[PDB]
Structure formats: C-alpha cells, structure tokens
Design a protein around this ligand. Structure first.
Ligand SMILES: C=CC[C@@H]1/C=C(\C)C[C@H](C)C[C@H](OC)[C@H]2O[C@@](O)(C(=O)C(=O)N3CCCC[C@H]3C(=O)O[C@H](/C(C)=C/[C@@H]3CC[C@@H](O)[C@H](OC)C3)[C@H](C)[C@@H](O)CC1=O)[C@H](C)C[C@@H]2OC
Length: 123
C-alpha cells in the first residue's frame, strides 16, 4: 500500500491501487502523449459522473501542457506505466470556483481512478 500527498497543501493526494513497471523508462515525461483509462466521481455525492469506459476509448493527452486540470498533470507525472491509482483533487487543482459544464459545480472536490496504459515521446 501507498498513499502519496503530491502537493504540500494536500490539494492532490494519490493512493496507489496497483504499482506499475519499474524503470525510469516507465515514467512519462513532460510533452509526452499519455494514454489512460479513468473513472471520475464527485466527492460530495460520491457518484460517478464520467469514465473512458462508457465509450471504451482510452483517453489521450499531452502531459503538462495545460490540456488537463492541474491535479491530473500532477498525478499522472508521478505514475509508472501500468500503475492504477485513486487521486483526490480539490477545487484549486480542479475546476475551481468556475466548475465545468453542469456536471461539475464550483468548489467541487474530484475523485479519479486512473490507469496509465502507456505513453510515447514526440518529435
Ligand atoms: C472542448 C472539447 C471537448 C474536449 C473533450 C474530449 C477531448 C473528451 C474527453 C474524454 C473529455 C470528456 O469528454 C466527455 C469529459 O471529461 C470530463 O467528464 C472529466 O471527467 C474530466 O474532468 N476530465 C477528463 C479527463 C482528464 C481530466 C479532466 C480534463 O482535464 O478534461 C479536459 C479539460 C476540460 C481541460 C480544461 C482545459 C482548460 C483549463 O483551463 C481547464 O481548467 C480550468 C481544464 C478535457 C479533456 C479537455 O482538455 C478537452 C475537451 O474538453 C470533463 C468534466 C468533461 C469532458 O467533456 C468536456
């Protein structure tokens, strides 16, 4: 077991559910295209609001390019290939006071289960 606080203020806490592959080559780097599966829920209601499994299409994004909420860049950059984790993301590292669409209210704490399937360096 291993629970990790990724930010001094505790706005991002990652609980490892399954350790990944050993090796620095198994750690995604900034700018890399990352591929994951995820399940997201609101801590307030505990109900799942979205998941890549609804469509069965892994989610791909580029690490630390401002493409995803800050909490995600922080959490994924600390994961190893094939790692499964649960991450608690407070509004500050989520959608803040603005919220997102009508699915995520402002000042919402978010809970995500993320599985790092793979990643690749570009150029
Ligand atoms: C506009 C084009 C649609 C385009 C949608 C897709 C490619 C499909 C892709 C599976 C997203 C899902 O589509 C069903 C769906 O995923 C959510 O349900 C969700 O679980 C979530 O929170 N995610 C998705 C997984 C990564 C973390 C976070 C996110 O970062 O999402 C990202 C996000 C909004 C980042 C902003 C970027 C600007 C920052 O300023 C802001 O921060 C202030 C954060 C998404 C991926 C955007 O980069 C791209 C898009 O939005 C959102 C609740 C609503 C979102 O649909 C909209």
């Amino acid at each position: 077991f291993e629970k990790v606080e990724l930010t001094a203020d505790g706005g991002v806490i990652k609980t490892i559910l399954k350790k990944g592959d050993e090796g620095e080559e198994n750690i995604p780097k900034k700018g890399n295209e990352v591929t994951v599966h995820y399940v997201g829920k609101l801590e307030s209601t505990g109900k799942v609001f979205d998941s890549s499994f609804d469509r069965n299409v892994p989610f791909k994004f580029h690490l630390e390019q401002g493409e995803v909420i800050k909490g995600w860049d922080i959490c994924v950059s600390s994961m190893r290939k094939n790692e499964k984790c649960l991450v608690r993301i407070e509004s500050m590292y989520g959608y803040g006071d603005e919220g997102c669409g009508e699915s995520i209210p402002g000042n919402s704490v978010l809970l995500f289960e993320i599985e790092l399937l793979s990643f690749r360096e570009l150029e």
